[PDB]
Amino acid sequence: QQNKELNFKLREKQNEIFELKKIAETLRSKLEKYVDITKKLEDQNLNLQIKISDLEKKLSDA
């Protein structure tokens, strides 16, 4: 009844440990996605600034 409660508590900690590991696993997933998003956006923005610079020079004429 001490041992019994302790064992039940140990099972509940194990379950909490599994749930925290799943949470960590989800955060790492989302982190890796945002790193990729951030690189995509930078490369997209670089392409746009290049097209703009090109247009700017065209229009520098008149």
Next chain:
Amino acid sequence: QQNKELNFKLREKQNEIFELKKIAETLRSKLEKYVDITKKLEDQNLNLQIKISDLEKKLSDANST
């Protein structure tokens, strides 16, 4: 044995929770930073799209003058 093992294993799993929480909090702090970065790049992307269209039109309105 049994009762001392249980007590020890409990203290140990609670130790492990504390560490897993700190780890997840460290991931959240970096993620918050990446959400903020991405939001600024989205705002920039939108302004550049509008500027490109703006400029194309000026050019068209000068490719025809």
